[PDB]
Design an enzyme around this catalytic site. Structure first.
Site, PDB file in Angstrom:
ATOM      1  N   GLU A  30       0.819  -1.215   0.000  1.00 50.99           N
ATOM      2  CA  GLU A  30       0.000   0.000   0.000  1.00 50.99           C
ATOM      3  C   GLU A  30       0.858   1.274   0.000  1.00 50.99           C
ATOM      4  O   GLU A  30       0.488   2.282  -0.586  1.00 50.99           O
ATOM      5  CB  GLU A  30      -0.960   0.004   1.186  1.00 50.99           C
ATOM      6  CG  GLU A  30      -1.794   1.255   1.259  1.00 50.99           C
ATOM      7  CD  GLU A  30      -2.697   1.422   0.043  1.00 50.99           C
ATOM      8  OE1 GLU A  30      -3.070   0.402  -0.568  1.00 50.99           O
ATOM      9  OE2 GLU A  30      -3.034   2.570  -0.300  1.00 50.99           O
ATOM     10  N   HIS A  63      -4.443  -2.288   2.067  1.00 50.74           N
ATOM     11  CA  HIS A  63      -4.190  -1.749   3.394  1.00 50.74           C
ATOM     12  C   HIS A  63      -4.091  -2.878   4.361  1.00 50.74           C
ATOM     13  O   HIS A  63      -3.176  -2.926   5.183  1.00 50.74           O
ATOM     14  CB  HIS A  63      -5.291  -0.782   3.846  1.00 50.74           C
ATOM     15  CG  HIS A  63      -5.021   0.630   3.463  1.00 50.74           C
ATOM     16  ND1 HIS A  63      -5.380   1.147   2.238  1.00 50.74           N
ATOM     17  CD2 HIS A  63      -4.383   1.630   4.127  1.00 50.74           C
ATOM     18  CE1 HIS A  63      -4.994   2.409   2.171  1.00 50.74           C
ATOM     19  NE2 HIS A  63      -4.398   2.732   3.309  1.00 50.74           N
ATOM     20  N   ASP A 114      -8.751  -3.663   8.160  1.00 46.57           N
ATOM     21  CA  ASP A 114      -7.361  -3.262   8.271  1.00 46.57           C
ATOM     22  C   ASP A 114      -7.051  -2.666   9.658  1.00 46.57           C
ATOM     23  O   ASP A 114      -5.949  -2.830  10.188  1.00 46.57           O
ATOM     24  CB  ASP A 114      -6.929  -2.384   7.072  1.00 46.57           C
ATOM     25  CG  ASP A 114      -7.197  -0.881   7.245  1.00 46.57           C
ATOM     26  OD1 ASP A 114      -6.722  -0.261   8.216  1.00 46.57           O
ATOM     27  OD2 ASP A 114      -7.838  -0.293   6.342  1.00 46.57           O
ATOM     28  N   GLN A 115      -8.044  -2.038  10.274  1.00 42.64           N
ATOM     29  CA  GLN A 115      -7.819  -1.324  11.511  1.00 42.64           C
ATOM     30  C   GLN A 115      -7.653  -2.287  12.664  1.00 42.64           C
ATOM     31  O   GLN A 115      -6.953  -1.987  13.634  1.00 42.64           O
ATOM     32  CB  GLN A 115      -8.957  -0.345  11.775  1.00 42.64           C
ATOM     33  CG  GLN A 115      -9.013   0.751  10.730  1.00 42.64           C
ATOM     34  CD  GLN A 115     -10.203   1.651  10.884  1.00 42.64           C
ATOM     35  OE1 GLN A 115     -10.664   1.898  11.990  1.00 42.64           O
ATOM     36  NE2 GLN A 115     -10.720   2.141   9.763  1.00 42.64           N
ATOM     37  N   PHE A 139     -12.782  -1.461   5.902  1.00 41.28           N
ATOM     38  CA  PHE A 139     -11.972  -0.490   6.639  1.00 41.28           C
ATOM     39  C   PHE A 139     -11.578  -1.039   7.988  1.00 41.28           C
ATOM     40  O   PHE A 139     -10.414  -1.023   8.384  1.00 41.28           O
ATOM     41  CB  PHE A 139     -12.756   0.810   6.834  1.00 41.28           C
ATOM     42  CG  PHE A 139     -13.276   1.397   5.551  1.00 41.28           C
ATOM     43  CD1 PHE A 139     -12.418   1.991   4.648  1.00 41.28           C
ATOM     44  CD2 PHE A 139     -14.614   1.311   5.239  1.00 41.28           C
ATOM     45  CE1 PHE A 139     -12.893   2.510   3.451  1.00 41.28           C
ATOM     46  CE2 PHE A 139     -15.098   1.828   4.038  1.00 41.28           C
ATOM     47  CZ  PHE A 139     -14.230   2.440   3.158  1.00 41.28           C
TER      48      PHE A 139
HETATM   49  N1  LIG Z   1     -13.973   6.541   4.455  1.00 39.15           N
HETATM   50  C1  LIG Z   1     -13.412   5.776   5.506  1.00 39.15           C
HETATM   51  N2  LIG Z   1     -14.123   5.250   6.540  1.00 39.15           N
HETATM   52  C2  LIG Z   1     -13.533   4.549   7.512  1.00 39.15           C
HETATM   53  N3  LIG Z   1     -12.206   4.314   7.557  1.00 39.15           N
HETATM   54  C3  LIG Z   1     -11.450   4.824   6.553  1.00 39.15           C
HETATM   55  C4  LIG Z   1     -12.027   5.573   5.496  1.00 39.15           C
HETATM   56  N4  LIG Z   1     -11.039   5.958   4.651  1.00 39.15           N
HETATM   57  C5  LIG Z   1      -9.894   5.498   5.086  1.00 39.15           C
HETATM   58  N5  LIG Z   1     -10.118   4.797   6.234  1.00 39.15           N
HETATM   59  C6  LIG Z   1      -9.091   4.163   7.044  1.00 39.15           C
HETATM   60  O1  LIG Z   1      -8.011   5.082   7.158  1.00 39.15           O
HETATM   61  C7  LIG Z   1      -6.757   4.385   6.970  1.00 39.15           C
HETATM   62  C8  LIG Z   1      -6.140   4.878   5.685  1.00 39.15           C
HETATM   63  O2  LIG Z   1      -4.730   5.003   5.821  1.00 39.15           O
HETATM   64  C9  LIG Z   1      -7.104   2.897   6.994  1.00 39.15           C
HETATM   65  O3  LIG Z   1      -7.116   2.419   8.342  1.00 39.15           O
HETATM   66  C10 LIG Z   1      -8.522   2.891   6.430  1.00 39.15           C
HETATM   67  O4  LIG Z   1      -9.300   1.777   6.794  1.00 39.15           O
END
Ligand SMILES: Nc1ncnc2c1ncn2[C@@H]1O[C@H](CO)[C@@H](O)[C@H]1O
Length: 341
Positions: free
Chosen positions: A10, A307, A286-287, A283
């Site tokens: 990424e 990601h 990845d978090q 999302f």
């Molecule tokens: N529109 C969104 N809603 C929720 N999380 C987001 C969104 N855009 C990016 N992210 C999160 O932000 C980070 C991008 O570097 C990742 O953890 C990604 O999942």
RNA sequence: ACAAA
């Protein structure tokens, strides 16, 4: 020390954030090179810089290369200690991404950590703060993490000036997450806000989102928030409460973008996330990665992203083998923690 | 109109 190549996969800010968080938790020094190679404006931005400085404070670290524009950072941590965090990003830099760097470290600090962060709450290419507080934190509660994230004032691009406060408790009781398929959508909730703008902006975002979500045949309740700050901005997040986790979708206003399009976008994102029938949206997928290494469990995601794969690679660079991934990028998949640390 | 990634 270990060197992490920030151009891998990424190629974004998340490599830097996860690296410094894991350095702080494990005590292993790290050098990140080629920072944000796969982004239009490479090197550290204010968001990354202030995240690094806060972790530096928590771990009493020595840091080299910590300046805006730097493509290389050396981070050498000492003891991770709970201290109060106060950060002023100075731009509309993403508070939620600063929190993404901080959260894993803060919960390993052994005592409660309070934080106050100013910057952008609702800005492009990052989670909106209402996503973090209502979707991400909801999932984190399931593995035993407790905290609070409160929006005191909104902040948008370009002026920022948002204010977020909260805290986390030490992660003393860790529990595995098991989130495969959902069997029921109970209801849709959401928050549509508008700041320094006519109140119909918030109402119209919500009404347009509701329109697109009628097809789901469940109750929909989207709260509206009218607020003030130092500039105009708006946004909406919607989420499906299921029998397992919440899946989200969201969108941001900008000058000239009709409120209806904003609401419609957020709803369609949520619809896209629900389609595969998996519990974890792309999302959150990845978090959750850095936390799952310590909690154990299994998640099925709507879509495996770069990601997510890149975050796995960073985590395993520090902790060794942790995950088994069944599925290809761009498709729904299954992530098992096959070794918990 | 690179204060947003
Ligand atoms: N529109 C969104 N809603 C929720 N999380 C987001 C969104 N855009 C990016 N992210 C999160 O932000 C980070 C991008 O570097 C990742 O953890 C990604 O999942």
């Amino acid at each position: 020390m270990i060197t992490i190549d920030g151009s891998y996969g990424e190629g974004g800010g998340q490599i830097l954030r996860t690296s410094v968080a894991l350095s702080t938790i494990t005590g292993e020094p790290v050098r990140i090179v080629n920072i944000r190679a796969n982004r239009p404006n490479p090197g550290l931005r204010p968001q990354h810089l202030h995240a690094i400085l806060a972790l530096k404070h928590l771990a009493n670290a020595e840091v080299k290369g910590a300046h805006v524009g730097s493509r290389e950072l050396v981070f050498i941590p000492k003891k991770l200690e709970a201290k109060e965090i106060s950060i002023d990003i100075g731009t509309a830099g993403s508070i939620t991404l600063v929190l993404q760097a901080l959260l894993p470290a803060m919960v390993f600090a052994r005592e409660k950590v309070k934080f106050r962060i100013t910057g952008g709450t609702d800005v492009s290419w990052s989670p909106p703060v209402d996503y973090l507080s209502n979707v991400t934190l909801f999932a984190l509660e399931k593995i035993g993490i407790h905290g609070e994230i409160r929006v005191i004032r909104r902040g948008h691009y370009p002026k920022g000036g948002g204010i977020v406060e909260g805290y986390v408790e030490p992660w003393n009781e860790k529990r595995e997450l098991v989130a495969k398929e959902y069997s029921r959508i109970i209801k849709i909730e959401g928050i549509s806000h508008a700041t320094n703008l006519p109140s119909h902006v918030a109402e119209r975002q919500a009404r347009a989102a509701k329109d697109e979500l009628l097809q789901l045949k469940v109750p929909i309740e989207i709260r509206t928030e009218i607020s003030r700050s130092i500039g105009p901005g708006s946004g909406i997040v919607v989420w499906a409460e299921t029998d397992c986790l919440r899946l989200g979708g969201d969108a941001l206003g900008k000058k000239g973008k009709p409120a209806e399009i904003v609401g419609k976008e957020a709803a369609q994102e949520l619809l896209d996330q629900l389609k595969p029938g998996h519990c974890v949206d792309k999302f959150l997928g990845d978090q959750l990665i850095p936390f799952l290494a310590f909690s154990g469990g299994v998640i099925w995601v709507s879509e495996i992203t770069n990601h997510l794969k890149t975050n796995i690679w960073v985590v395993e660079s520090f902790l060794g083998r942790i995950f088994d991934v069944d599925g290809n990028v761009g498709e729904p998949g299954k992530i098992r923690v096959i070794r918990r640390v």
